[PDB]
Write a protein that holds these residues in place. Structure first.
Motif, PDB file in Angstrom:
ATOM      1  N   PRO B 275       0.843  -1.232  -0.126  1.00  0.00           N
ATOM      2  CA  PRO B 275       0.054  -0.027  -0.037  1.00  0.00           C
ATOM      3  C   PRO B 275       0.876   1.314   0.081  1.00  0.00           C
ATOM      4  N   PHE B 276       1.211   1.596  -1.276  1.00  0.00           N
ATOM      5  CA  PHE B 276       2.034   2.901  -1.412  1.00  0.00           C
ATOM      6  C   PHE B 276       1.052   4.218  -1.093  1.00  0.00           C
ATOM      7  N   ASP B 277       0.062   3.978  -1.208  1.00  0.00           N
ATOM      8  CA  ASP B 277      -1.119   5.216  -0.957  1.00  0.00           C
ATOM      9  C   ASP B 277      -2.513   4.558  -0.417  1.00  0.00           C
ATOM     10  N   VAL B 278      -2.953   5.230   0.519  1.00  0.00           N
ATOM     11  CA  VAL B 278      -4.156   4.668   1.024  1.00  0.00           C
ATOM     12  C   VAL B 278      -5.181   5.443   0.044  1.00  0.00           C
ATOM     13  N   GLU B 279      -5.041   6.452  -0.508  1.00  0.00           N
ATOM     14  CA  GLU B 279      -6.027   7.138  -1.574  1.00  0.00           C
ATOM     15  C   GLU B 279      -6.462   6.454  -2.326  1.00  0.00           C
ATOM     16  N   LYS B 280      -5.554   5.471  -2.874  1.00  0.00           N
ATOM     17  CA  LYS B 280      -6.002   4.440  -4.167  1.00  0.00           C
ATOM     18  C   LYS B 280      -6.918   3.176  -3.586  1.00  0.00           C
ATOM     19  N   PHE B 281      -6.388   2.589  -2.351  1.00  0.00           N
ATOM     20  CA  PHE B 281      -6.691   1.202  -1.779  1.00  0.00           C
ATOM     21  C   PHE B 281      -8.030   1.457  -1.262  1.00  0.00           C
TER      22      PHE B 281
ATOM     23  N   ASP C 223      -9.354  10.072   9.477  1.00  0.00           N
ATOM     24  CA  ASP C 223      -8.060   9.852   8.810  1.00  0.00           C
ATOM     25  C   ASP C 223      -8.011  10.057   7.291  1.00  0.00           C
ATOM     26  N   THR C 224      -9.201  10.387   6.958  1.00  0.00           N
ATOM     27  CA  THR C 224      -9.614  10.630   5.309  1.00  0.00           C
ATOM     28  C   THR C 224      -9.821  12.038   5.044  1.00  0.00           C
ATOM     29  N   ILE C 225     -10.425  12.842   5.717  1.00  0.00           N
ATOM     30  CA  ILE C 225     -10.909  14.263   5.853  1.00  0.00           C
ATOM     31  C   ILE C 225      -9.667  15.257   5.794  1.00  0.00           C
ATOM     32  N   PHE C 226      -8.830  14.763   7.078  1.00  0.00           N
ATOM     33  CA  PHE C 226      -7.487  15.440   7.210  1.00  0.00           C
ATOM     34  C   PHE C 226      -6.488  15.418   6.214  1.00  0.00           C
ATOM     35  N   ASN C 227      -6.495  14.215   5.711  1.00  0.00           N
ATOM     36  CA  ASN C 227      -5.696  13.963   4.233  1.00  0.00           C
ATOM     37  C   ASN C 227      -6.339  13.713   3.219  1.00  0.00           C
TER      38      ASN C 227
END
Lengths: 431, 345, 355, 302
Positions: B275-281, C223-227
């Motif tokens: 998991p390089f980025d949480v944004e994608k996963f 942990d989604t809204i902050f980032n």
């Protein structure tokens, strides 16, 4: 319970969309960079359809070719598509008699007018249709309804008032009202033939039309018998209720979840903003249904496909979607707006609440606000637009052009201002 | 490679694709079972005669399956698991067809030194062993896990969604020598219904149940003994994707109070992906469940997400069917089951 | 006299520090209590808007009404049965909802005013001057002081900034409204909410009515809204002697995250809000409420469902206990904006001795 | 008559007579000429001259703080409703007496703040102040053993300036870079820091790398010091880690360059929070945390 056939009413609400539907058909138009038919077909597949029917006449060749290219001509598909070719532009009643003459209708069939995107599971609907059909013999068709956005003060095109039973959920009256746009009429007259048979009368205007129908084998026989009925809602439903055949029933189904039929431009705009938001929980861009789609969800409701190219120091907004193979220049603001696949964008461009379809080039230093752009059309430099300004197919707007509110541009090279060719009626040009 | 060759012979490919996209299929455990039965149908029906053409075809099928659904890691892992079981037996077979192969241990370093049969039957049995492994994980957990928790200790639990963790908790409560208080965070936008069923099953067994709002987690952290995670997917660096809502903050709350964090998982649940980025996963939820009325929803741009991620900095143990491992070691358990090439399909 | 004892739900093994009971529907009471008190107690029992600040303002106005309605008896003087009647009010208020700190300072001010005025002056001349003084007291300590907080915050906040908030604090609503209208900045306001009360929902609604770029979120998803996030404002209830922030539910969680993720926490407060009672954890003195508010399944306050949960008394241990008022840790907040302008929470009690 | 020009005249001077105390002495000279009797004619023109001084400021905070104290003293003069002439004469005289108080305070501190440096302790010093170096010199006068570590501060190469001023005393030194400053906190007993300003909260207004020192020391559990003269207090509250009054850049990111000209730009002044300071030393006794705020509340009476 198994084996279900569906009929889709296309070539139905054309020219209701005023500047478009000139060269290409009604349902070909993309909502979220993907055709409106695809949404409907996905709804069919989730419902459990084994045989599909489509009604094409105007621009029918482009529809048939699109079905040839579609994911359903391939053998593995749960349903097969067969197109009905009719005379150019006719009412729904005329098509109903044509299909009854051909005679393919078996048991319970499906009819949908227009293209509807909904997250509502249909398995529940079928069961409650069947439970109510087992209640009494002379029972006909099923209608879908959903709860409105508290007050329908912005919704003027659909002023349908429904009178419903609290116990059996049977519709009593249908009425259209000009009320807020045209203050002329106030009165609504109701038939007092069904007073003590129902008792629990419930009158509501706070319900959105869907025009999705589960229908019995009775329907095509009634259409041939009574050929005076042209419509399916305004005259037909009212005609069924008002003692045409005594003892015949029609359903009205209430659902809490989102279900809105597309009909007008400003309704289309709201549905699109609802799709960009997480209103339709399953129906989201990231899941990818068209298979060629490679959209990925990003926080703050921002959608990006694969191969998205963007210049540095650029700000993106809220509830936005950008297609594949798309290039953007510096100094750009994208707020609450959809941009299609393979769209090249210049520099210093401020976009708010607007719309752009596939393969569109925008000139440098231009501000676009709450206005729509069709496929393969180019915008020039120094272009300022206002609310509800829909731009047609292949429309080349040249450098230095200002257009005020609701300035619609024609898609065919008739009666309204601005055409397809270079400098569109800012200096007389156009065929 | 497309599904044009596998259409009349194999139909169940497209029905699983349909089950993923519309989310008719639910829970990683079930997704794994389906893909197992898919690969069961693929070997039983197909005709190949060649081995390398077969393996690369399977790789392309797995590549298309993960592109069809990104949150189906259990789909991706099961294929990768059989791929490696295949690759070892092929490398054993090539040594006999040609004719030290035993240096010390079972290492790596594929950058240093260079290089009819019953292979299909082994492939068949390899699927069968995977099923039996997924069938029985709880037996392998309970022998390591029910050794670490004490009497009069209070347990706070995010993600009540996991079938694995609840059954681990019930086996410990079965022991009359062990007493513990259970705090359960609600996880409002998604977990609510599951959290309420969790609280019902704890009362059914008569365990001291405490339902906690997601705000009150801090207001209890001084009193908390241990934290337990009901994870969906575990990663290389250690970190986890869990079954929705209110985990990340709880783990942050635990680390600040220096309260221990536990994780219950399987090796099929374990992933060789990074998991390089949480944004994608991470997958995002439906804002419809938060706030009604659409005319205010023009101005009310609400944010909600299903899956929650935890960084490896918080959790300390991953008790599996094999045993308990530290996040700084879990990569080796992964490489013991999946090969280096079997990542980028 | 009132209804006492016999309470819904279990007594609970853990957390039993405060009363969990009380009168919602009016049955068996004294026929002398002023109806404006009876209205406020029925309000505060199931209130959705109030949070520390507005409660005292209403309590002051109710008192002003009572004094205006007060006619001195011919036999018994002014300071005879007044203070007993006020003690009956507070006891009825206590039965409905545990009082705030600001309420206590008001009562203390009123009891000081009773002792200040001797029974010798005429009755109509006395109460006319009294209510004028209370009005001036409420003007200074609240309204003017609030305006002072407004301008103190105005200098502190940078141009074009993102703010995350929590609660239903009157001071912060007016703060953000001032930012949107008078100063005209690009303020992205994100509001968070819990389960027992949709306080932030109401705040966001009022901000929407002003026309603000508002995101609305929950504790589960942070942990989604902050980032994104810069300054975080917290609705103060009471700052203690140590400098611990005693505030509403989902406050400390936010406070922790902000300290961890660089850009810190700011708190707006009143000079009347400070107390001298001190504590260090949330268990000490909590404002507990009945699990009746947590029966509903999502969405709104009144929904009425045949859901999964329903039983509490008959169920063999199923404590669905929620809390309302929590404690943020001392070091985590950084700024306090009060009557006396500014000061860190480490300083705390430089106002209590200054009076 | 000018005030900015009077401050500019101090070039080869400086030391003992501090930068703020020279600005306060310039404020008194401007006051005493054009009659201090009138409170309407004078105070408004004093406020305009301070406003002109702030507008001419590039990177200084303490001049704004020193004006405040002056103002306060002026207002406090006629607080007793005294003769409008004897109170005026006492106000003019408290200008030279203010600068004379910088001597007396330095005499106090250098005998109080030598106690903190114990028998044989290695010190890492950062951010040069007149009070901290006066402790260092008058401890050498007390004949006490102490080792010194030089930090490579980068405002106008201050580390080299600090190193040379330590050489003129007779104390062994070596250059340590602020990058490697983390690798030193184990052989260093105590870390001393001289401030450019002390916050209302209890934090510090300082140079090009002081917060970084504060945090590392908090990690290593090794003490962190603030030593100054008691005039550097503003009613300032930096809410965040990167918010300060500036005339220059608040972190600028430049475009593509080839000649190499636009580069340097970084936060030259940085804030650190109240928790990182172990101890504070001024002439106003030995006090650290909330003490600063108490002082400020005592002055401002608000």
């Amino acid at each position: 319970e198994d084996r279900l056939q569906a009929v889709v009413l296309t070539d139905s609400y054309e020219t209701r969309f005023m500047p478009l539907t000139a060269v290409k058909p009604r349902c070909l138009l993309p909502l979220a960079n993907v055709p409106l038919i695809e949404y409907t077909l996905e709804f069919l597949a989730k419902a459990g359809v084994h045989e599909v029917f489509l009604i094409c006449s105007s621009h029918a060749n482009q529809i048939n070719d699109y079905i040839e290219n579609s994911k359903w001509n391939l053998p593995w598909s749960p349903f097969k598509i067969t197109t009905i070719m009719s005379p150019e532009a006719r009412c729904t009643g005329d098509v109903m008699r044509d299909l009854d003459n051909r005679g393919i209708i078996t048991g319970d069939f499906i009819l949908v007018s227009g293209d509807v995107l909904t997250n509502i599971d249909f398995s529940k609907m079928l069961e409650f249709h069947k439970k109510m059909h087992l209640q009494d013999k002379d029972h006909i068709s099923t209608m879908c309804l959903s709860k409105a956005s508290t007050y329908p003060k912005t919704r003027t095109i659909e002023p349908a008032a429904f009178v419903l039973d609290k116990s059996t959920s049977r519709c009593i009256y249908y009425q259209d009202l000009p009320l807020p746009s045209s203050r002329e009429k106030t009165s609504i007259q109701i038939d007092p033939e069904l007073l003590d048979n129902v008792d629990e009368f419930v009158i509501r205007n706070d319900l959105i039309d869907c025009r999705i129908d589960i229908c019995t084998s009775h329907v095509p026989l009634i259409f041939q018998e009574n050929f005076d009925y042209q419509s399916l809602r305004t005259d037909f439903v009212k005609g069924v209720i008002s003692s045409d055949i005594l003892g015949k029933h029609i359903y009205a189904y209430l659902t809490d979840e989102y279900a809105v039929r597309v009909e007008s431009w400003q309704t289309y705009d709201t549905i699109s903003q609802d799709f960009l938001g997480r209103w339709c929980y399953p129906l989201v861009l990231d899941s990818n249904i068209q298979d060629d789609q490679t959209y990925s969800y990003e926080s703050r409701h921002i959608y990006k496909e694969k191969d998205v190219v963007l210049a540095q120091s650029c700000k993106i907004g809220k509830c936005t979607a950008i297609g594949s193979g798309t290039k953007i220049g510096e100094g750009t603001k994208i707020e609450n707006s959809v941009i299609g696949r393979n769209c090249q964008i210049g520099e210093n461009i401020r976009i708010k609440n607007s719309f752009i379809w596939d393969d569109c080039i925008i000139g440098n230093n231009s501000i676009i606000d709450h206005s729509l752009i069709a496929s393969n059309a180019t915008l020039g430099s120094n272009v300022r637009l206002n609310d509800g300004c829909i731009i047609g197919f292949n429309v080349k707007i040249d450098d230095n052009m200002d257009l005020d509110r609701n300035t619609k541009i024609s898609a065919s090279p008739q009666d309204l201002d601005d055409q397809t060719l270079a400098v569109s009626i800012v200096g007389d040009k156009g065929v | 490679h497309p599904n044009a060759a596998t259409s009349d012979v194999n139909v169940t490919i497209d029905t699983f694709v349909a089950k993923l996209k519309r989310r008719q299929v639910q829970g990683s455990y079930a997704i794994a079972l389906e893909t197992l039965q898919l690969l069961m149908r693929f070997i039983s029906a197909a005709r190949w005669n060649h081995v390398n053409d077969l393996i690369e075809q399977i790789r392309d099928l797995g590549n298309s399956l993960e592109k069809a659904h990104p949150t189906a890691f259990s789909c991706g892992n099961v294929i990768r698991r059989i791929l490696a079981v295949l690759r070892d037996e092929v490398e054993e077979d090539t040594m006999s067809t040609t004719v030290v192969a035993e240096p010390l241990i079972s290492s790596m370093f594929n950058l240093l030194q260079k290089p009819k049969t019953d292979y299909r039957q082994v492939a068949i049995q390899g699927i069968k062993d995977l099923i039996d492994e997924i069938k029985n994980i709880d037996e392998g957990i309970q022998q390591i896990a029910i050794d670490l928790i004490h009497d009069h200790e209070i347990l706070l639990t995010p993600t009540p969604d996991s079938k694995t963790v609840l059954k681990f908790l019930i086996t410990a409560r079965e022991r009359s020598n062990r007493t513990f208080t259970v705090l359960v965070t609600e996880g409002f936008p998604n977990n609510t219904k599951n959290a309420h069923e969790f609280a019902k099953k704890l009362a059914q067994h008569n365990i001291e149940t405490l339902v906690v709002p997601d705000s009150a987690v801090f207001a209890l952290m001084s009193r908390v003994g241990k934290v337990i995670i009901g994870t969906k997917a575990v990663f290389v660096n250690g970190g986890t994707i869990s079954s929705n809502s209110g985990v990340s903050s709880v783990c942050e709350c635990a680390r600040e109070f220096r309260t221990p964090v536990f994780a219950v998982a399987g090796l099929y649940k374990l992933s060789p992906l990074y998991p390089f980025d949480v944004e994608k996963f991470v997958e995002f939820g439906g804002s419809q469940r938060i706030l009604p009325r659409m005319d205010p929803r023009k101005r009310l741009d609400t944010v909600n997400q299903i899956t929650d991620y935890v960084p490896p900095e918080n959790i300390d143990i991953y008790i599996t069917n094999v045993g308990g491992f530290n996040p700084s070691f879990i990569y080796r358990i992964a490489w013991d089951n999946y090969k280096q090439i079997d990542v980028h399909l | 006299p009132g209804i006492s004892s016999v309470i819904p739900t279990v007594l609970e093994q853990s957390f039993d520090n405060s009363s969990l009971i009380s009168v919602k529907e009016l049955l068996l009471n004294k026929d002398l209590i002023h109806p404006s008190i009876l209205l406020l107690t029925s309000h505060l029992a199931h209130y959705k808007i109030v949070g520390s600040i507005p409660r005292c303002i209403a309590m002051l106005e109710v008192f002003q009404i009572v004094i205006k309605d007060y006619q001195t008896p011919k036999g018994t003087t002014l300071s005879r049965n007044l203070t007993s009647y006020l003690s009956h009010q507070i006891d009825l208020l206590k039965k409905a909802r545990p009082l705030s700190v600001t309420m206590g300072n008001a009562i203390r001010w009123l009891k000081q005013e009773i002792s200040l005025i001797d029974p010798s002056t005429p009755d109509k001349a006395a109460k006319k001057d009294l209510c004028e003084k209370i009005g001036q007291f409420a003007k200074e300590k609240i309204e003017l002081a609030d305006q002072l907080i407004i301008d103190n915050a105005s200098t502190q906040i940078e141009e074009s900034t993102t703010i995350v908030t929590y609660g239903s604090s009157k001071v912060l609503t007016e703060l953000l409204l001032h930012n949107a209208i008078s100063l005209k900045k690009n303020i992205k306001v994100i509001v968070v909410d819990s389960r027992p009360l949709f306080e932030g929902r109401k705040m966001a609604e009022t901000l929407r009515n002003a026309g603000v770029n508002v995101m609305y979120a929950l504790i589960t998803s942070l942990d989604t809204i902050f980032n994104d996030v810069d300054y975080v404002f917290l609705g103060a209830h009471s700052i203690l002697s140590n400098g611990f922030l005693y505030s509403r539910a989902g406050t400390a969680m936010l406070a922790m995250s902000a300290k961890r993720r660089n850009i810190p926490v700011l708190v707006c407060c009143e000079s009347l809000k400070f107390s001298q009672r001190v504590q260090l954890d949330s268990v000490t003195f909590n404002e507990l409420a009945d699990p009746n508010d947590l029966v509903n399944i999502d969405y709104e306050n009144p929904v009425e469902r045949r859901g999964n949960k329903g039983a509490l008394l008959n169920q063999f241990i199923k404590e669905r206990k929620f809390e309302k008022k929590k404690l943020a840790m001392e070091n985590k907040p950084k700024g306090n904006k009060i009557g006396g302008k500014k000061g860190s929470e480490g300083e705390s009690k430089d106002a209590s001795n200054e009076e | 008559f000018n005030i900015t020009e009077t401050y500019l005249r101090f070039l080869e001077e400086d030391t003992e007579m501090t930068m703020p105390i020279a600005a306060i002495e310039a404020l008194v000279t401007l006051l005493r000429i054009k009659t201090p009797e009138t409170a309407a004619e004078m105070i408004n023109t004093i406020k305009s001259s301070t406003e002109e001084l702030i507008k001419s400021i590039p990177n200084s905070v303490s001049l704004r703080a020193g004006c405040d104290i002056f103002m306060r003293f002026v207002l406090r003069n006629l607080h007793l409703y005294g003769d409008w002439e004897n109170c005026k004469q006492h106000l003019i005289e408290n200008g030279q007496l203010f600068v004379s108080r910088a001597k007396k305070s330095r005499n106090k501190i250098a005998e109080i703040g030598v106690d903190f440096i114990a028998d044989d302790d290695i010190i890492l010093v950062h951010g040069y102040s007149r009070a901290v170096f006066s402790l260092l010199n008058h401890a050498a006068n007390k004949f006490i053993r102490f080792r010194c570590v030089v930090t490579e501060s980068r405002p106008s190469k201050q580390g080299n300036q600090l190193y040379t001023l330590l050489e003129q005393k007779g104390i062994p030194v070596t250059l340590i870079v602020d990058s490697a400053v983390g690798a030193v906190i184990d052989k260093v007993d105590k870390v001393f820091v001289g401030a450019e300003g002390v916050a209302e909260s209890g934090g510090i207004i300082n140079l090009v790398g002081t917060y970084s020192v504060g945090v590392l020391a908090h990690n290593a559990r090794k003490p962190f010091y603030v030593v100054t003269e008691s005039h550097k207090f503003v009613r300032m509250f930096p809410l965040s880690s990167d918010d300060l009054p500036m005339a220059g850049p608040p972190l600028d990111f430049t475009r593509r360059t080839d000649d190499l000209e636009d580069a340097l730009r970084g936060p030259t002044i940085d804030y650190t929070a109240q928790e990182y300071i172990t101890a504070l030393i001024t002439d106003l006794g030995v006090l650290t945390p909330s003490a600063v705020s108490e002082e400020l509340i005592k002055m401002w009476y608000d």
